[PDB]
Amino acid sequence: ELLELDKWASLWN
Residue 12 DSSP class: G
Amino acid at 8: W
Task: Round to whole Å and give the CA distance between 3 and 1.
Answer: 6
Experimental determination technique: NMR
Type of residue numbered 2: L
| Intra-chain end-to-end CA distance of the chain, in Å | 18
- Mapped onto helix, strand or coil, the DSSP state of residue 2 is coil
What is the total residue count of the chain?
A: 13
| Cα of 8 vs its chain's centroid, Å | 4
d(CA 4, CA 2): 6
